[PDB]
Amino acid sequence: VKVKSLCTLQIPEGVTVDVKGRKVTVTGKRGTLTKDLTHLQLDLRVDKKNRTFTVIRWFGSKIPIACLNTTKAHVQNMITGVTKGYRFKVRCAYAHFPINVSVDGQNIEVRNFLGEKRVRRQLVPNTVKVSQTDPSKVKDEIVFDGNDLEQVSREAAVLHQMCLVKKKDIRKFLDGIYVQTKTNIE
RNA sequence: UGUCGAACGGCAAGUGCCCCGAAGCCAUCGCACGGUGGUUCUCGGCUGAACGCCUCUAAGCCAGAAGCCAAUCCCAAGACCAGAUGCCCACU
Ligand SMILES: [K+]
Ligand SMILES: [Mg+2]
Ligand SMILES: [Mg+2]
Ligand SMILES: [Mg+2]
Ligand SMILES: [Mg+2]
């Protein structure tokens, strides 16, 4: 086993990172985020004066060490989402039947997917803001905005998986809703 | 067809036989009724290391089968219910 494995993260000036019992709270200009990491058993340390975040594993084999960079990646995603946000833009791709998408508040209704009469409905959680781009700018573009990368990507994924083609060749029939661009709000 | 003499009333033929026949029972031969949520598999994904890349997976998470569990339905305290309650008595 290795005595000491260490990962360090730098923190931007605006961000505030606090750890207490493997629970990380990240505060930026556009909100706050929380992460429950009590399943990890790592030594999380924040240096406020030097604005560094450190995660340490003591006496670890390969499996515990693999969690260090996972923790650093989660905290970095929280910092980025609390200072810039996440914006996932999905596109409706169809051959013949135009996929009709309605965004009334937090509810997404998908109609006419491959000409079907069934209505696919998604209730986006309140931490993710879903909008629909004007068709004159980009046709069939739905945008997800949020501070949490995991929540935004999960919403885009559940929208993608509501429109899977069943009982047809998948190489053909490329109809679906696919995330195209993953960028930041600011 | 016998038989009480006839008529009436019947009776006998282990319900004489034939027609119709209420009540009751009864026929998918008639009529009524037969629900709702979860945990997950296979699988597809998200975030994400290991392995500066990548990766559904290693930690975490999402969606999810006529399966499985509970709701509903049936029996139900030897499941010994210090659950509630009405009277009488005992103790007070
Ligand atoms: K999976
Ligand atoms: Mg075919
Ligand atoms: Mg007779
Ligand atoms: Mg019957
Ligand atoms: Mg990935």
- Say how far apart CA A83 and CA A32 lie, in whole Å: 10
Structure tokens at A108: 């997404």
Task: Please report where in the chains the tokens 């996929």 appear, as a residue.
Answer: A99
Hey, what's the torsion of the CAs at A34, A72, A27, A80, to 10 degrees?
Answer: -110
Tokens of A57: 């594993």
Indicate which technique resolved this structure: cryo-EM
Residue in A162, A122, A177, A125 with CA at minimum distance from that of residue A147: A125
| CA A68 – CA A90 distance, rounded (Å) | 32
Separation CA A130–CA A22 (nearest Å): 31
Structure tokens that stand for A16 in this block: 């505030």
CA distance A133 to A86: 16
- Tell me, in Å, how far CA of A185 is from C1' of B62? 23
Rounded CA-CA distance A77/A167 in Å is 38
d(CA A62, CA A2): 9
Angle at A81 between CA A101 and CA A11, to 5 degrees: 170
In Å, what resolution does this model reach? Answer: 2.7
d(CA A175, CA A91): 11
Please check whether strand B approaches the CB of A150 to within 7 Å: yes
What number of residues does chain A have? 186
Euclidean distance between CA atoms A148 and A163, whole angstroms: 24
Nucleotide of closest approach to A86 (CA, C1'): B47
CB of A46 within 7 Å of some strand B atom: no
Q: Half-sphere exposure of residue A165, counting CA atoms within 13 Å on the CB side?
A: 18
CA distances from residue A112 to A56, A109, A139, A186 in whole angstroms, order as listed: 52, 10, 16, 34
- Write down the H helix ranges in chain A: 62-83, 149-161
Which-ligand-closest: CA of A172?
2
Assess contact for A99 and A177: CB atoms under 8 A: yes
